[PDB]
């Protein structure tokens, strides 16, 4: 059958019994850095069993009148085990990810999500003169949520979270040009994306640059008759792939 997968990374295994196919990047697989493109002169650290495993983020609830969520994920994994320790003692670092969003419901529920993973997402602020601060842009393994209203401008520093403009000023329908999948509760049960390292430099600092953004937007909202289970959660498990670091220093 074409509905069962099994992904094994490190000492963790994610299985699924009904699913769509897996979408992989822009056609490439995450691999290490070659000697033609390297610019640093110290030998990198590849632990590759301790940091290449599945880390499970916190769960969010899919209500009926929900709008959306987003994570960043060079930053959502900053407190998760030995991946968050190598980010502190090192100055550089590159990695690729594999993302597995999972959300299950019965045959009597209905709904549809859009699981997209965009690179270099600059967000717009509510106040037209300032740029948004750090704690309004990203939370460590905690989802920041879209709204379906318009955020006022006289707040200090807040992201404009109108969901039909997706926070970046583009149409939310045209977000399907990025690598994406749909979780349709009629057929699908989980989405899987394998993302390579997309950046204009071969290595970058991991504490002041978030080169990805995982957005989950419900296009057709959740609905059910009276009697079914009203609590439907969403859980996201991310796993780094082929990670390496340079520039060992103090803790910061």
């Amino acid at each position, epitope marked *: 059958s074409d509905r069962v997968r099994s992904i094994t990374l490190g000492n963790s295994t994610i299985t699924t019994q009904e699913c769509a196919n897996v979408v992989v990047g822009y056609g490439v697989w995450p691999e290490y850095l070659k000697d033609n493109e390297a610019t640093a002169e110290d030998q990198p650290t590849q632990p590759d069993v301790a940091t290449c495993r599945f880390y499970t983020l916190e769960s969010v609830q899919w*209500m009926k*009148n*929900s*709008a959306g969520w987003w994570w960043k994920l060079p930053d959502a994994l900053s407190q998760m085990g030995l991946f968050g320790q190598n980010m502190q003692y090192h100055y550089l670092g590159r990695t690729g990810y594999t993302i597995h969003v999972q959300c299950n419901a019965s045959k009597f529920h209905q709904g549809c999500l859009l699981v997209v993973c965009v690179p270099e997402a600059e967000m717009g602020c509510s106040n037209l003169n300032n740029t948004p*601060e*750090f*704690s*309004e842009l990203s*939370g460590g393994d*905690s989802a*920041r*949520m*879209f*709204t*379906d*209203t*318009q955020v*006022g*401008e*006289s*707040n*200090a*520093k807040k992201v404009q*979270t109108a969901v039909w403009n997706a926070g970046m000023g583009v149409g939310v329908g045209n977000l399907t040009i990025f690598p994406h999948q749909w979780i349709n509760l009629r057929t699908n049960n989980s989405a899987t994306l394998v993302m390579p390292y997309i950046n204009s430099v071969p290595m970058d600092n991991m504490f002041r640059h978030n080169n990805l953004t995982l957005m989950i937007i419900p296009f057709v909202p959740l609905n059910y008759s009276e009697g079914s289970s009203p609590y439907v959660p969403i859980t996201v498990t991310i796993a780094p792939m082929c990670a390496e670091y340079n520039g060992l220093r103090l803790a910061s």
Partner: antibody
Amino acid sequence: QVQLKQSGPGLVQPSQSLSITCTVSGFSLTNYGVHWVRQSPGKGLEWLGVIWRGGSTDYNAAFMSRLSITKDNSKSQVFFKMNSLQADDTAIYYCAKGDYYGYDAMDSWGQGTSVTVSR
Amino acid sequence: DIQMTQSPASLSVSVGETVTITCRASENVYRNLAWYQQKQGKSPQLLVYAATNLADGVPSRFSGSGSGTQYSLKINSLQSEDFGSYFCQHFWSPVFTFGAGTKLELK
């Protein structure tokens, strides 16, 4: 899950300072902001000030020169201070957290301490 | 700033009928409105946020609607535990202002 609660002085002399400490439980100050709302019997409900999740504050216009709200992220406590305490400040003061699914509404409120400004 | 004029100031109705409480802003707030309910001598509880959405534990008797400047709240079947006060409080812009207040005697 149990939520925030406060503790105040109760009775304050005129032209003095007032300080209620609202301590929280079950969440962090790195994700939510705590408002301060004054329930008055004569002027009704009114909004005094807020401290956001980033640390910046935003006060009311009429209470600008007297209010000062700070917090500590580690001990999970917020502090507020009003000065010069005139006669109409006999009311009950609430602390309440914001960001109800990103919508900046108050979900849970403190028990409220009733203050009196008189001798 | 912006004022919220709430009407009517009081009501006297019985158990099981449909009422409607409205409040009007000064200018457009883009559906940034929250409704509260306060009983005698406790803290106010959030009832309807963002002018349409329901809260966590609030049953489906309450319903809020409106857009632009005119908003409303409607209970189709009023019950015995639902008296008290009701306020509307916009969060579009600091300074946030509350409503005047409505009272339900349930006579």
